[PDB]
Amino acid sequence: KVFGRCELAAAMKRHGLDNYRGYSLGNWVCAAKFESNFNTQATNRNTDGSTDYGILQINSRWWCNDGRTPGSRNLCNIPCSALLSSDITASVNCAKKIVSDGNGMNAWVAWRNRCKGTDVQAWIRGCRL
Numbered sequence: 001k002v003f004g005r006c007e008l009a010a011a012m013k014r015h016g017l018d019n020y021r022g023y024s025l026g027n028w029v030c031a032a033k034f035e036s037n038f039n040t041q042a043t044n045r046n047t048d049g050s051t052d053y054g055i056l057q058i059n060s061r062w063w064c065n066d067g068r069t070p071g072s073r074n075l076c077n078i079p080c081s082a083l084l085s086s087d088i089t090a091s092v093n094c095a096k097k098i099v100s101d102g103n104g105m106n107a108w109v110a111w112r113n114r115c116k117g118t119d120v121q122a123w124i125r126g127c128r129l
C-alpha cells in the first residue's frame with residue numbers, strides 16, 4: 001500500500017506517534033515520505049547485508065528478523081515482512097521503540113538529512129487533525 005499524505009498522518013496519529021518523544025507528527029510524515037515515499041512495501045538492501053523494511057524503512061540488523069542478516073538483533077521481536085503490511089501498526093510500534101533507544105529520530109538517516117531542522121509542519125498541512 002502507498003499511503004496518501006493525510007491518510008498516513010491520520011494513521012500515525014491514531015497509533016500514537018504525534019509528539020511521541022517530542023517529535024511532532026510532521027516529523028513522522030516527513031520521515032516516511034523520504035524513507036519510503038509512503039510505500040508500505042518499500043525494501044532496500046544495505047551494504048552491510050541488512051535490509052530496511054516498510055513505510056519507515058526499519059532496519060533488519062537491529063529491529064526485525066528477516067533470516068538473512070548475519071549478526072542481527074531483533075529488538076522489535078517481529079518478522080520484517082510484518083513491517084510491510086498495509087496496516088502500519090507494527091511499523092509504528094517498532095518506530096516508537098527505535099526513537100526511544102537513544103538517538104531519537106536520528107535513527108532515520110532520511111529524517112536527519114532531509115527533515116531535521118526543517119518546517120516539518122508543512123507535512124501535515126490540510127489534514128483533518
Ligand SMILES: CC(=O)N[C@@H]1[C@@H](O)[C@H](O[C@@H]2O[C@H](CO)[C@@H](O[C@@H]3O[C@H](CO)[C@@H](O)[C@H](O)[C@H]3NC(C)=O)[C@H](O)[C@H]2NC(C)=O)[C@@H](CO)O[C@H]1O
Nearest residue numbers: 052056057058059061062063075098101102103107108109
Ligand atoms: C530506522 C532504523 O532502523 N534506523 C537504523 C538505525 O537504528 C541504525 O543505527 C544504530 O541504531 C542502534 C539502535 O538505536 C544504535 O544502538 C544504540 O546506541 C545508543 C547510543 O548511540 C545506545 O543508547 C543503545 O544502547 C544502542 N542500542 C542497541 C540495541 O545497541 C546504534 O548506535 C546505531 N548505529 C549507528 C551507526 O548509528 C543504523 C545502523 O544499523 O541503521 C539505520 O537504518
Ligand code: NA
Nearest residue numbers: 065066069072
Ligand atoms: Na535478523
